[PDB]
Every structure is written in structure tokens, then in C-alpha cells.
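TICKET: design request
STATUS: open
ATTACHED STRUCTURE:
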């Protein structure tokens, strides 16, 4: 991805987008009880913790585009992956608008809490001023989409989240894009049925984990990932994507039945027009993280990429024996015979991708079911029910989350969430987590589930 042009918003008639000054993140009552190193991401240029230039840092993800045509390998990769998705029978028919907006099986209702994008953010208009959960009104919505139309710019926000010391100091805060409400609704109409099918079929046919429930899905991953494990990471996956990968995505959508006119919103995604605070800029390439189904589209492109890179390094590879599940940039995959992921990494560098060993590893050593992670969680079979696989979130990451809060009014929901992750670490680890929670008075006012209850409901859930 590449920023082709950047100007002051006022030169184009755009108002300044007023965007959060300080973080909503505050130390929680558990800040002193648990150990932790993460702090809220930098959101302001003057942050005293910055040891780098903030604006330069947040845009350094746009490392550029490799300008190439869709080559041999990409075509065979698009064909093979397409044929997998052919078996799902994804309807290319528009989703009817009340489904797309107010919810349906496989596609949650449009989030009424997030930004409405441009121009609503500039007019003081919130989503709850256009949409009502209880009335399911489409009257105002239709009026707005007719009024302001489509391909509106995107509002860029800095993501308010906990980050490491390294990333706070390098100012490498993450950027998410708010699509206009018009374009979110139009995109969920066009690809609603695709999002529904993917959400309802996580695994090795979709090559996608978007929407999965790890309490359930993780016992199925070892059954699907048959051979030797492949696993690695990206740096700045979303903004490293070159336009050629969107051409591949457009090709895969057309093989699925989408017309050229329906794939035009892949061009709205690839060549985007953004509003960040007082600046305004165009980007050629890169996935605008935060737009509609960017996670699904990232996952689809990642199926194209890995397949492409296998074809180019291992001529004679048999993609029919290849399995992979992707969540955006996060990949877990398998093949019957060993594969050198460092070779795949070098090849990806030729396509403008930054691939590293899995989990900040020093080298691309052998990935095992002991050390592999997915969605930051480890894999640990139950000792009593071996075919049952615990998703194990490390207690370090739970410790980091519990020390902060964006609203202490949700202390009960937040801590109970962490419990549902923490118990998979085992009963001794769990009761220590509970013990230290109850060493603060709030901890004793909370309804925390018991270990036996968690494990029972888990075993029963199957």
C-alpha cells in the first residue's frame, strides 16, 4: 500500500475530524494486583513517551506497492481456492437490506456503537440517529444513502488499545478506518451472503476462521490440519498488500459469480480516500482495516497468497493435499511433507509482503502442536477427553487486559470474559487468578463462575 497524495483537509473543503485526545484506557482496580508491561497506544503527537515521530510512524505501514501483473502462480492459486469456495454455494444475490443492517443468521447487525463515517461524523449525526434496533426502520437510512450516495471518503482513527513498551515508544499505533454508513450498508448488501457463508463455515473449505468460537472450533483444527504444521506471521499485512492481490481477489469473486460491477467495491477498498484529523490523503493499495468484511477479504487474499507462494517455490506441490485456516493475516496450515517457510518468506518479499517466523521466533524452526498459536491462543488437548482441544490464552495476556479499563461500569462483564479464557490454563492457574481478583473488594462483589461449572459447560457444549 502507498500514500499517493496528502494535503491539508481545508484545501479541499473538508472539515477537520475531531478525534480522541487522550485514551479511554485507565488503570483498573486490579492494576496493582497483577503484573504487566503494556500501556495505552500513543494517540497524540506530543505524547511524552514517544521516542519517535508519531505521524511518520502510524503511516509507515504503507511500505509501498510492487507493481506487477497477475502471474502464472496467482492464476493457479485463484483457480484452486475458487474451486474450494465453489462447493459452498455462496449466493451472489444481494442481501435484502433489513437483513444486512439489522441482523440475520451468520451476519450480526451493523454495529450501532461505531463511527458513522463521513459526512455524518462532521454533522454530529450518530448511527442511533439513523437506525433503531427496536423499530428496524430503513426510512432514514434510505434517505441518507440516496442523499450522500457512495464511495464516500473514510475517516481514519488511531486505535485506542494496550501496546507494548517498544510499540508505544516507536509510536507504532494501529490505524482503523471508519467506512461511511452508506458504504458499509451497500457492502453488506453486496457480500452479505458471502459473509454469512464464511461466518457459518470456518475451517479448511473457506480457509477462514472469521467468526469462529475457539471454545468449539479448536478441537476441530487438528482434525482438519492433517500433516506437518506451517505457521508464520506478517508485519503490517493489511497495508503491505499491493494492488495485484486485489486483482486476484476480484478474479476469485468473479469466478464465484459476482459481476464486474459488484467487484467495483474491491476498487473502493484498494484505492481509498481518507480523512485523518486535519489531513486528507489517497492510498493506492492496502486493506483499509475497519471497513466492511476486511477480515474476510484479508483471509481470502491470504489463501491466494500462500497458495501462490507454494506454487512458485515448490513446483510440483499438490495444493489438493494443502490445508490452511486464515484469520486476516494470521495463518495456520499444513502439508503432508515438510515445507521451508523461510523460502515462502523470501518469495513473499518479492510480492511486497513482510513474513516473519511464527511468534517473534528467531528462525523458522519446526512448528509443533506444543508451540503453535492461533488468534494468540495455544493448543492443549484435555487430559481426560483427548479429542477435546483447549484454546489456551496465556495468563500474561489476561494479566495485561485486567490491569486497565475503558469503563469500570463493565468490571463484571470484563472480568467474567477473562475468566472464560483463563480457565483453559488449568484449575491451579484459575484459582490463583480468582484469589488475586478477590484480594480487592470489587473482586468479592463479582459473580465469577466456578472452575467445575466452566469445565462442565465446556464439555457439555459439544
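STATUS: resolved
RESOLUTION: sequence designed for all positions
ATTACHED SEQUENCE:
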Amino acid at each position: 500500500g502507498e500514500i499517493e497524495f496528502i494535503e491539508s483537509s481545508k484545501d479541499a473543503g473538508f472539515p477537520v475530524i475531531n478525534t480522541p485526545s487522550k485514551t479511554k484506557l485507565e488503570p483498573s482496580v486490579f492494576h496493582q494486583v497483577f503484573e504487566g508491561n503494556k500501556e495505552p497506544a500513543v494517540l497524540r503527537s506530543g505524547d511524552p513517551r514517544l521516542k519517535a515521530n508519531f505521524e511518520e510512524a502510524i503511516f509507515s505501514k504503507y511500505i509501498g506497492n510492487v507493481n506487477t501483473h497477475v502471474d502464472e502462480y496467482m492464476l493457479e492459486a485463484v483457480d484452486h481456492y475458487a474451486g474450494q469456495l465453489a462447493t459452498l454455494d455462496i449466493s451472489t444475490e444481494p442481501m435484502k437490506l433489513e437483513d444486512a443492517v439489522y441482523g440475520t443468521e451468520g451476519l450480526e447487525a451493523l454495529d450501532l456503537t461505531t463511527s458513522a463515517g463521513y459526512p455524518y461524523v462532521a454533522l454530529g449525526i450518530k448511527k442511533r440517529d439513523i437506525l433503531s434496533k427496536k423499530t428496524k426502520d430503513l426510512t432514514k437510512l434510505k434517505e441518507c444513502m440516496d442523499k450522500y450516495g457512495l464511495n464516500l471518503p473514510m475517516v481514519t482513527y488511531v486505535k485506542d488499545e494496550l501496546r507494548s513498551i517498544e510499540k508505544v515508544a516507536k509510536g507504532k499505533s494501529r490505524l482503523i478506518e471508519a467506512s461511511s454508513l452508506n458504504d458499509s450498508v451497500a457492502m453488506r448488501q453486496t457480500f452479505g451472503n458471502l459473509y454469512k457463508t464464511f461466518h457459518l463455515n470456518p475451517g479448511v473449505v473457506t480457509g477462514s476462521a472469521v467468526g469462529c468460537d475457539p471454545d468449539l472450533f479448536w478441537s476441530k483444527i487438528p482434525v482438519m490440519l492433517d500433516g506437518h504444521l506451517i505457521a508464520f506471521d506478517y508485519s503490517g499485512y493489511d497495508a503491505s498488500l499491493s494492488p495485484v492481490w486485489f486483482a486476484c481477489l476480484k478474479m476469485i469473486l468473479e469466478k464465484l459469480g459476482y459481476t464486474h460491477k459488484e467487484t467495483n467495491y474491491i476498487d473502493y477498498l484498494c484505492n481509498s480516500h481518507h480523512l485523518y484529523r486535519d489531513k486528507h490523503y489517497f492510498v493506492r493499495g492496502g486493506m483499509p482495516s475497519g471497513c466492511s468484511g476486511t477480515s474476510i477479504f484479508n483471509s481470502m487474499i491470504n489463501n491466494i497468497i500462500i497458495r501462490t507462494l507454494m506454487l512458485k517455490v515448490y513446483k510440483g506441490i499438490d495444493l489438493d493435499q494443502f490445508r490452511m485456516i486464515a484469520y486476516g493475516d494470521d495463518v495456520i496450515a499444513s502439508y503432508p511433507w515438510p515445507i521451508d517457510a523461510s523460502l515462502l518468506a523470501e518469495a513473499g518479499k518479492g510480492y511486497g509482503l513482510i513474513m516473519t517466523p511464527a511468534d517473534k521466533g528467531e528462525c523458522y524452526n519446526e512448528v509443533t502442536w506444543t508451540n503453535v498459536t492461533f488468534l494468540k491462543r495455544y493448543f492443549r488437548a484435555d487430559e481426560q477427553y483427548p479429542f477435546l482441544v483447549h484454546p489456551v490464552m496465556p495468563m500474561k495476556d489476561i494479566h495485561e487486559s485486567i490491569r486497565w479499563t475503558k469503563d469500570p461500569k463493565n468490571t463484571q462483564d470484563h472480568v467474567r470474559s477473562l475468566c472464560l479464557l483463563a480457565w483453559h490454563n488449568g484449575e491451579h492457574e484459575y484459582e490463583e487468578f480468582i484469589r488475586k481478583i478477590r484480594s480487592v473488594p470489587v473482586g468479592r462483589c463479582l459473580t465469577l463462575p466456578a472452575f467445575s461449572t466452566l469445565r462442565r459447560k465446556w464439555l457439555d457444549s459439544f
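CLOSING REMARK: The domain at 213-242+293-368 is CATH 3.30.70.270 (Alpha-Beta Plaits). The radius of gyration is 23 Å.
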